Every structure is written in structure tokens, then in C-alpha cells.
């Protein structure tokens, strides 16, 4: 450990075009393994990792019906949200769920998640105590009151401590050949002429897993995270990730700049120059 299981569920209303779009994807750490797509030829819960193709048909059947139930939940919640905020019925809107659990060195629950969002903003979320809710606006206070009265926090907590955590261990055993790996980043600094006065130093990080990494430029101990360009971490497409950070430095002073890479696969953080 530690490890994490996450589902990212999206519904997008399409008035005048048909029923809402609905898609759910499941991730173990930074590895996707399942999906449900309402716009596919045959909408059904299906594997997206090779180590999931050995599950019986009753796994996919039960997961599909749960996904079909949630799709109806999103259709209702989208209409209710439209009403809560007194919005026009002709606009497209988004509702998102994000739920899962974190397990650790000994493979038991660190933290459970039940997060909900409307049009890309926090709506309501289950607190870490797995008992109380945090509502983002007064419309979500209505939701929170209703879910508090019904005791849905106990329903979610039972899932987080039971199904979420026990199935995460099962996934971690099915894909133990690939999921438990730790690929250290291969890092180096490149040189790119820019002007007659300065030059670009680009620090690369390649082929690392998991995706979490820190790239930092410093000038003689002092730090440069204000002045640098830092792209988002991106997937290579083969199961590893990439990232780079660049800085504009004056000609002749490249050796005064150092790039630092922090990663779970790095025993000691790397410090690089050109």
C-alpha cells in the first residue's frame, strides 16, 4: 500500500437532442479498469484493463444494473437541480459523482469519498467522519437535510467499509503483476535557444508511475515555481506518465539553475542541471 479505488461518473443533459449522456469510469490508483458508456453500441459495464477479463458474467450483470440505476438517479437529480436553481429547461447541465476509498500499508480504510458536483462545482460531499455532510450552497442544504433525515450516510459508510474496500483488495490481487509496480521517472534537462539574451531550459520526467510527481526549478537554493512553465502531467499511452517544467535563463548562467524531481519511486530526490 497505499492504494485507492475511484469512480468518476458524469451525466450531461441534452434538451432537444435526447436523454442525458451518462458515463462512469473506474480507477485503481492511476489505472482505469472499468467503464459504462450510455452512448456505446451496447451500453454495459465492461472491462478496460486486461486483468479484469477473468470475472464471471454475474459481476458484469450486477455492475450494469447498478449503473443503470444510477443513470436514472442522474436524470432525476439533473431535473431537481434545474428546479432548485430555477434555471431554463433548454440549457445543458452537468452532474458528477466521485466516490471510492483509500487503503494503506495494511489494506484497510483510510478515507472514504462520496462527492457530488453540479455544473463543475462542489454541491455536497460526505465528510471524513462518514457521518455528516458539507453542503456548498443553500440549495444543497435542502439535499443535506433530506439525506440526514433518511440516514443515507450510513448507507454510504457501509459501502465504503464493506464493498469498496474488499473489492479494492480483489482488484489489487487480480492485477498484482502491473498494479503494484513503481516506475521511477527518467529525468534530464534539455537546452533550447530562445533569443540573443536568454535560453530555455526544459526539465523532462518520463515513464513514471504513479502519476503524482513534483518538478521544481531552483536558482542557487532559492526557488523558481513562480517564473516557470509547468505543463499538466500527461499519460504516455502505455501506462506511464510524463511531465516537464521549463524556465528562461540568461545565456552563460545555465549551471546556476537546478531541476528537482520528487517521486515515490525515487529513493533520493534527483537534482539535475543541463
Amino acid at each position: 500500500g497505499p492504494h485507492s479505488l475511484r469512480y468518476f461518473v458524469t451525466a450531461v443533459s441534452r434538451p432537444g437532442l435526447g436523454e442525458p449522456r451518462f458515463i462512469a469510469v473506474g480507477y485503481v490508483d492511476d489505472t482505469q479498469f472499468v467503464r459504462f458508456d450510455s452512448d456505446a453500441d451496447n451500453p454495459r459495464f465492461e472491462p478496460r484493463a486486461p486483468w479484469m477479463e477473468q470475472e464471471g458474467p454475474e459481476y458484469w450483470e450486477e455492475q450494469t444494473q447498478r449503473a443503470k440505476s444510477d443513470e436514472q438517479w442522474f436524470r432525476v437529480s439533473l431535473r431537481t437541480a434545474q428546479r432548485y436553481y430555477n434555471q431554463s429547461k433548454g440549457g445543458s447541465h452537468t452532474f458528477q459523482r466521485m466516490f471510492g476509498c483509500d487503503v494503506g500499508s495494511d489494506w484497510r480504510l483510510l478515507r472514504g469519498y462520496q462527492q457530488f458536483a453540479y455544473d463543475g462545482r462542489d454541491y455536497i460531499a460526505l465528510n471524513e467522519d462518514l457521518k455528516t455532510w458539507t453542503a456548498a450552497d443553500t440549495a444543497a442544504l435542502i439535499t443535506r437535510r433530506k439525506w440526514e433525515q433518511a440516514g443515507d450516510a450510513e448507507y454510504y459508510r457501509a459501502y465504503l467499509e464493506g464493498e469498496c474496500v474488499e473489492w479494492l483488495r480483489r482488484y489489487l490481487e487480480l492485477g498484482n503483476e502491473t498494479l503494484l509496480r513503481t516506475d521511477s521517472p527518467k529525468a534530464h534537462v534539455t537546452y533550447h535557444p530562445r533569443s540573443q539574451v536568454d535560453v530555455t531550459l526544459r526539465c523532462w520526467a518520463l515513464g513514471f508511475y504513479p502519476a503524482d510527481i513534483t518538478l521544481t526549478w531552483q536558482l542557487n537554493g532559492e526557488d523558481l515555481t513562480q517564473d516557470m512553465e509547468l505543463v499538466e502531467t500527461r499519460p504516455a499511452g502505455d501506462g506511464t506518465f510524463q511531465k516537464w517544467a521549463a524556465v528562461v535563463v540568461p545565456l552563460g548562467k545555465e549551471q546556476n539553475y537546478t531541476c528537482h524531481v520528487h517521486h515515490k519511486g525515487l529513493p533520493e530526490p534527483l537534482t539535475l542541471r543541463w
Binding site: 469510469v25 482505469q32 452537468t94 455544473d119 463543475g120 533550447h192 500527461r234
Partner: protein
């Protein structure tokens, strides 16, 4: 109600070598809402055999997608990604640069 402009990255899966097969990637991330147009271009023409990941999002709820296609790079073939989104006044073309 809120809008997030996509960040676009065009790059290859492996370091580009002329003559050996590779994968061309166009990674769009941090955008909202989810409707987006992404196309990979070879010499300005839309590539047909393009795959894309399933729609997912980050901790801040912003969406991300990866479009990818198999290609064998040459010295003269120009490649690019064309992205259109409600936050962009016109489609944004990002050319493939072997150093980015």
C-alpha cells in the same frame, strides 16, 4: 455557469524516430463543460483512425481526454491537433513539436 479552458498537449508516446511506428497523442485537460471537438491532423487533413479515452475528470471536477493514433513519423510529415470548445472563439491548432 463557469467555464474552464482546455490545456492542449501534442506529443508522441515514445521519443520520435523517423521510420519506426509510434503513437501520436493529443491530451486535453482541465476543461468544462465536457462537450469538446478533438481531431488529429496529418499535413492539415483529419486522421480517421483516432481512438480516445473514456471521459474522466480530476479532483477539481475538470474533464480530461486523450486522443491517440498510430503513425510512423517522417522528416517532412507535419502533425497537429485541432481542438474546439465553447471557451475558444475559434478552433485552436497545436502543431506537433518533437521538443514539447
Amino acid at each position: 455557469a463557469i467555464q474552464r479552458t482546455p490545456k492542449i498537449q501534442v506529443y508522441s508516446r515514445h521519443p520520435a524516430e523517423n521510420g519506426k511506428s509510434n503513437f501520436l497523442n493529443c491530451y486535453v485537460s482541465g476543461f468544462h463543460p465536457s462537450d469538446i471537438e478533438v481531431d488529429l491532423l496529418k499535413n492539415g487533413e483529419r486522421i480517421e483512425k483516432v481512438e480516445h479515452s473514456d471521459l474522466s475528470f480530476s479532483k477539481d471536477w475538470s474533464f480530461y481526454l486523450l486522443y491517440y493514433t498510430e503513425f510512423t513519423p517522417t522528416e517532412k510529415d507535419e502533425y497537429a491537433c485541432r481542438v474546439n470548445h465553447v471557451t475558444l472563439s475559434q478552433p485552436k491548432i497545436v502543431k506537433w513539436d518533437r521538443d514539447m
